[PDB]
Amino acid sequence: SSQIRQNYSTEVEAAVNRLVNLYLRASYTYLSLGFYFDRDDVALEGVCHFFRELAEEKREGAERLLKMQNQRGGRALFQDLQKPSQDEWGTTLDAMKAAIVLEKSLNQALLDLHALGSAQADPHLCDFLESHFLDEEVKLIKKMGDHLTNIQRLVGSQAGLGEYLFERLTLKH
Amino acid sequence: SSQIRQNYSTEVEAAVNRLVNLYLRASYTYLSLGFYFDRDDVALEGVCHFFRELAEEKREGAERLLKMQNQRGGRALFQDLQKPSQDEWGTTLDAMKAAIVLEKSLNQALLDLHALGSAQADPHLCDFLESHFLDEEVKLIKKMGDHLTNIQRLVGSQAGLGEYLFERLTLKH
């Protein structure tokens, strides 16, 4: 059972498990995005690398949540992981827009869990999200927004040219 | 506009811009204090160095606020910067007293913004102030209070002697 659990509500425990699912879902989404941009008929290596990096980051966030769950004496519970929302992700612009939507959904789940922790007077939970999640998410969304802006300015008259140039001169390859 | 902004109130945005003004004001105050102690008819190099260091620190705090403003998708807005409150700053004691007053005003602005962020349920803002501002300010005010105490004990019967000795043996030169 638990010899250690203290000030750790069932509501937070359950919300943490749900959040783990959301992060692993997001990881799966990024895995799919990365392999889509690796297709020979898409072939945007920097875009592939960007999303594959994110798949790892999201899996790592899930692992951190699970470690914390055990540190507090809650019980990790896993649920089915739904497949990503698309099988093909369109253009780099389409993909970066979908990524921002995803990140905003993760961010809102972080904020909701912070609020629950505040309401439950669980400062460890609140601190944990503050120290390892909230700023990481703000920085990532800023990066994506910066990317989106640059992608959009490159569409101009020649979408292919702009998409190639963004991948070559902004993304790491 | 903003593709990224999330959970970032107009009230916090505005308060952040005001705080930037207060930090740049404080930087300007320290610049003036530093050059006053550099005057040939004042000539207290360690006191000059102390305040010039602070001018840099305050400018850096303003820059951090502005970076954060952009990370959250708010709009930096600059206003006129008023000149420091004095053209001549008296003795080291006078100056350190004015510095403490200034720091307490900055500290109270930090606390007020934290409270606003708490009321707006903006944990990123709250965390940001906690991680980069609140303790830095507490440590600085403790240092100033320590300095003030030492300056006051040196006034004794011979103010000039005490003012020279404090600058030589406490402040870095």
Added chain:
Amino acid sequence: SSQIRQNYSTEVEAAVNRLVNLYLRASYTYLSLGFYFDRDDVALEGVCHFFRELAEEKREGAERLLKMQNQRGGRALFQDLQKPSQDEWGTTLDAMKAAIVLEKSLNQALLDLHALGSAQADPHLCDFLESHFLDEEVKLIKKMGDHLTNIQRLVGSQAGLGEYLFERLTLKH
């Protein structure tokens, strides 16, 4: 008072204080330009870096003037710092044009102060501007003019593309 002042007119003293204000103003302008290009909906990092570097350079020029003021036995006097002329700076081209205008105004203030120093037979002042300001300003204006030319040749038919390419391939990022 001053035990050191020699051959240092009140007119030069006053003009030096005014020039300090103009440099700190210019620094503030560059600060605003830098954070504008950091906006997620602008997102031109090399342009942000270019102007943030300039903000530092202009603050440094003000500090050098103030140091000199004290070396000659004049009295630094600070005035209010007006806010930059715009809250949003348009395109890179708009910004570089505004920067050149600013630099030409600083250059003319340098030249006017040199002429005053010559008329007052103050060779130290004249030398000081020659050694630390005049050539620095000529080199900067040449750089800006070079930049302007390249930005203008890239507008062509596709302004977004050209603006991205200039930032990627000319400016440091």
Added chain:
Amino acid sequence: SSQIRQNYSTEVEAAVNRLVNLYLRASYTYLSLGFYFDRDDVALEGVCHFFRELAEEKREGAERLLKMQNQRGGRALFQDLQKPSQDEWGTTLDAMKAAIVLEKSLNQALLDLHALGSAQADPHLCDFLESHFLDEEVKLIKKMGDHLTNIQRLVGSQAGLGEYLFERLTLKH
């Protein structure tokens, strides 16, 4: 005779020789000041070191003038060197006051020679004074003024104590 002399007036040549005399005079003054503070009944080593350093600097300035005289094709002419104005130099304060008076006299001779060079349209002479003399002199006078201020604040009620402390904690020993 001179195969090289060009644009080098007899008036400047003569003024350069006079200036050499003034620098060697100043060197002699500093030599005397240094050995006075080395007396067993004065015994202020940092004050001795300060003035002995200056004796060397002034001799070096004379040597630079003489080198320049030959570079321009003028004729070095030496005159008698008068002895310093005092045989005993009083207190550190007395000495630093006498040093400032001396430096202001050297500075005025520099300025007068610059003005002569300007009137004779001799830009090499003007440049030479600007590059090697005028700022060196301004910096030295600022240093002396800073010293004077600190010495004066230490007189207070206990002149001996203050004189010892200045020598120990400001001057290099």
